[PDB]
Symmetry: C2
Subunit: 121 residues, 2 copies
């Protein structure tokens, strides 16, 4: 009924996709959502429209798109809102409403993790 779509930059190296796959798995074992799909913005599959479509065909009527990026940038302000038919100027999504969330930001867990990496953990 609601779907969670985890959405990333995408890269030509495979670490970006692998990252989304690991994150998707980990939330799958939290058993919080009916449906969980990942989408990558650029040069990697699946794409964000493929993921949105997949959510819909799986039954879901309220789609939560969460951008897995550290800060706002072009992609989160122009490219993605476009790709979702949320901004006026290859895909439009039937009768279902799209719910576009905020990025990660300067979160305290991110400082936690930074300390860990600094000590070679």
């Amino acid at each position: 009924m609601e779907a969670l779509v985890l959405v990333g930059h995408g890269s030509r190296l495979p670490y970006s996709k692998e990252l989304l796959v690991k994150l998707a798995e980990k939330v799958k074992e939290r058993n919080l959502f009916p449906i969980v799909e990942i989408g990558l913005m650029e040069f990697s599959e699946p794409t964000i429209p493929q993921a949105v479509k997949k959510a819909i065909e799986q039954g879901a009527k309220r789609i939560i798109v969460v951008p897995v990026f550290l800060a706002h940038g072009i992609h989160t302000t122009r490219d993605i809102p476009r790709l979702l038919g949320l901004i006026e100027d290859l895909e439009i999504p039937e009768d279902v409403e799209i719910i576009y969330r905020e990025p990660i930001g300067a979160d305290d867990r991110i400082v936690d993790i930074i300390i860990d990496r600094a000590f070679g953990r």
Copy 2:
């Protein structure tokens, strides 16, 4: 003696740099290292070399660089190790050695944070 450098991507919008600034402040407040600096790889200032340099002239002999990026990609494998004279292409005194850490990766706290964002927290 030891320094922490936080290093980020950078963008033409200012949110990425602002994000680094917040992160740097917050780790300063945990009082863990003698020095803390930031650099931005692209567009903005300070630059990564400016940051490394800045730490050195301030006394630091082991420089711990943490890449504030979600996955390995080009920047964490090529651009940043380059900028730190870690791969043959930055004259650093042989009395100082640079220690390059892991990115964030698919850490469990990142799944925590993603759940929060999915709820609009």
